[model samples]
Target: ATFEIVNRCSYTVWAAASKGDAALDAGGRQLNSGESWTINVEPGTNGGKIWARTDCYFDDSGSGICKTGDCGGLLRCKRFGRPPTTLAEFSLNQYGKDYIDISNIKGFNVPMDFSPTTRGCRGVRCAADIVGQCPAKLKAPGGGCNDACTVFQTSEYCCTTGKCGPTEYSRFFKRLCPDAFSYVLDKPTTVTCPGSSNYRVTFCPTA
Candidate 1:
């Protein structure tokens, strides 16, 4: 499994990647605009997650925090990121093809474009200007947007009973990225790529 994490945003970003309990791309690292970092995962590596941390301020000891996508306030995130962070999740070489998605089940901060380097399989992405036009109620404190599950914490918004499905709240995100996961019950977002496919995860592609 290979991961090519690219920072297409103009500003600098701290990109992070993890596989289960293992840290693939450790924190305290920076990727400049147009720069990228690659990670070759161990064979049979599954359940890998990747995301970018924007507006981070780390100290000399590398123990500060990030404005968005902060994980335990540490340089290296041993766990998953907070809500409202765009995610590139994967279960590589599973079943038949690689299950991948630019998931916004937790909400979206930056635009994401994920695709296979090989041409045999298809790719998926959610590149939308979510922050510039996030809903007032679902807006994060400093910046970014929030999903209904994380914001309202209600059965209707969260689908706790499995009966509450996509309502008006989830429709906002669905309208933005029809190809990405908008809510828990979102069905048409995930796609399967060829196993061991080289992937390019880009953050904020050119408009």
Candidate 2:
């Protein structure tokens, strides 16, 4: 059987694993948002388990950097919000393209390599280093944080608290094509979480 993976994240993801084992080498070319790629798999290879691995990187470089206060400066892996669970399986025919609807599974929060200090810290404006401790005026408009503080103000608070701000590139792709296996970004996409975004799980059966 063959499977086509779609990338919906805002960043480029390198293929890490497929089927039941980690890929010895990178599997295929980088896929952009709304783009799709196909992979071949043996029947029941995983005993009904089908999966893939992906990580977010800066411009597909896959470089590691320190972004969290806890780790300080440690390498981080770029992965999906969660590892994709087998939704449905199918065989390919002579048709030009085949489609399988991959569904979002519970507990799929995959971690990425970038840190809040770097990506999230850009253009921040707040009074304190601790996220919640920052003055409410420096938080998002509704939080009472004033918009005037440029160094550590509204923007920083939102990103730090995961309330609002730029979406991680990989996360952006996921939001765009929640039904696909994977996604990458060719152009910029806007991602915002006023509170939290809701995603619907979708699936298809194998032939």
Candidate 3:
């Protein structure tokens, strides 16, 4: 399926994607506001993640650091990014369906909208200004917002011991972005679409 990654944010974002374990689209691209990049996913590809890096600068060979969502300081990322970043997860053509969700479990750096370009599938979005209103304890070094699990490192928010539920911090995120995964064991936010539908993942979505 085709996936279009769009930068609707006012500033630039280094967009990146990973297909299970390998880099997608050479891992990253510099996208100014209103720019968009496209990639294709093979049928049955699972554990895919797409996200954006903010406030970054790279050398000619695509190596540098970003204030948020830095993946080993490489423009062509081979691994999942660091925390305090919004994430779009995709599992295409799994049992004839495409499972997708917008996750804040890593925390949020920007607003996001993951939607099917064609009809028949529900869209999921996390359009809140999380970075601007991030709680004091959950704030990251940069402008990104950290999840409670990352900050406290306790089972209550991390769900590390195999059982957990929402807390005030999780509710904070959920109250703002109901369509996103506020915690690791968040409620069912995943949406399934037909295998044939194309998708769009927009950063800094309007709502």
Candidate 4:
């Protein structure tokens, strides 16, 4: 599958992606406004994740820290970055089809548009001003918004009990970005498309 990541956040964004233990595109790179990066994934790849980091400063050795979505002071991601991040997740050629979704269950930092480039399948986006509207308890140290589970760690919000449903916090997220996964059990957000269909992920996306 071909994945093009576009940044239009007005500020710098460090794009990161991974599939299992391997990093994609040398782990990550700096993306100025309007810059983009494309990646090609082999068939049968699963648990793919794409995300962006903001307020980052990297030294010559690509060693530094970011205010949000950092995975251990490395510009090149070694694993899935921290949460309170917007995610574009997919599994390519899984059982003869591609599955894609936009998940904010961990929280939201950037607006994202995740869509197929050629297929008629519908796209998903979470373009709401989540950081600005973040609840007091769910706010993170940086500009990002943290999920309820990250803050409370209760069975009510974390769904650890397997009997949890929507909460006030989850509903707040759902009310704004209706297409995203607001909670762990949130369904109806995943989309299936034909195999080999290319996809694009735009940060700070417009409606």
**C-alpha lDDT of all candidate models, in order:** 0.79, 0.27, 0.88, 0.87
lDDT of 2 by residue, 1-207 (tens): 434455554544333323223221233334554455554544323312222233432333434321111011112222221222222322122133222223222112222211111232211111122123323433332121122222233433223343443334223324533433222211322222111111111111111
Model 2: lDDT of residue 139: 38
Order of the predicted models by lDDT, top scorer first: 3, 4, 1, 2
lDDT of 2 at 23: 28
TM-score to true structure, per model: 0.91, 0.28, 0.95, 0.95
lDDT of 1 by residue, 1-207 (tens): 777888888877788777647676563257888898887765566777888888888877767878778777766777777777888888887866788888787788778888889888777778878887788998988468888889989988887785767877688988888887777777756777877778888888754
Best by lDDT: 3
Cα shift from native, residue 130, model 4 (Å): 0.9
- Per-residue lDDT tens digits for candidate 4, residues 7-61, read 9989999998887488865778889999999987777888888999999988999
Alpha carbon lDDT of residue 158, candidate 2?
A: 28
Q: List the residue pairs that clash in candidate 3.
A: none
lDDT of 1 at 58: 81
Candidate 3 local lDDT, 1-207, one digit each (tens): 888999999999998898647887578888999999998877788898999899998899888899899898889888888888899999988888889999999899988899998788888888877878888999998778999988999999889897798999998899899889999888878999998678999998875
Clashing residue pairs in candidate 4, if any? Answer: none
Pairwise lDDT winner, candidates 1 and 3: 3
Better of 2 and 4 by TM-score: 4
